[PDB]
Design an enzyme around this catalytic site. Sequence first.
Site, PDB file in Angstrom:
ATOM      1  N   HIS A 151     -44.892   6.925  11.623  1.00  0.00           N
ATOM      2  CA  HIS A 151     -44.415   5.667  11.049  1.00  0.00           C
ATOM      3  C   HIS A 151     -45.108   5.422   9.428  1.00  0.00           C
ATOM      4  CE1 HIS A 151     -43.871   0.993  11.361  1.00  0.00           C
ATOM      5  NE2 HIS A 151     -42.564   1.716  11.403  1.00  0.00           N
ATOM      6  N   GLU A 162     -33.862   6.112   3.883  1.00  0.00           N
ATOM      7  CA  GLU A 162     -34.390   6.586   4.910  1.00  0.00           C
ATOM      8  C   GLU A 162     -33.499   6.380   6.093  1.00  0.00           C
ATOM      9  OE1 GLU A 162     -36.957   3.963   7.074  1.00  0.00           O
ATOM     10  OE2 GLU A 162     -37.224   2.730   5.282  1.00  0.00           O
TER      11      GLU A 162
END
Lengths: 108, 88
Positions: free
Chosen positions: A100, A71
């Site tokens: 998120h 990520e």
Amino acid sequence: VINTFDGVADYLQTYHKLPDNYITKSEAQALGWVASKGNLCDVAPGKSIGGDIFSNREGKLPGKSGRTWREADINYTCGFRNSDRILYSSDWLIYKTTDHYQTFTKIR
Amino acid sequence: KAVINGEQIRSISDLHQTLKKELALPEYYGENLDALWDALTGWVEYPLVLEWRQFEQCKQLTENGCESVLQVFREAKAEGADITIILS
């Protein structure tokens, strides 16, 4: 910097690495990053957190034993971190989240 | 210092909302295991002490997920986050 969804996705697909303006959490911490102080740009100017293993804990991204996910933060320009992340696999699938990690959308 | 009163937790969503308030997590907090990992390794203030009282009552909830939440705290600690966990 290269820090947008399409900017980082295009760069990843072309060069098979993140742009130079990314550093991992541990590398940032070694420089003095303290997340609760929002101080990444004090210790690493122009940088964003990125490159860490993404463990895909909710199983939302397609997984298999030979595939690693990572990520990186998107749209970060110093201060506290935001809700935007790019997710990229070792076989170069690319997804994004703007909420998120609640939902993910394939972009490559 | 953060306290979870397990006797008062009615669902996994309640658990995440309580963590959000007790740990001063971001307003955008995703209330999922990946969001929790991110907050525990790249948002929260350290040293962090989590006291989870009556974890056993979470296990009685119909929804699964209690051990998985605890596991994220333990993995964040193993990653190097200054986290202390109290099971009371």
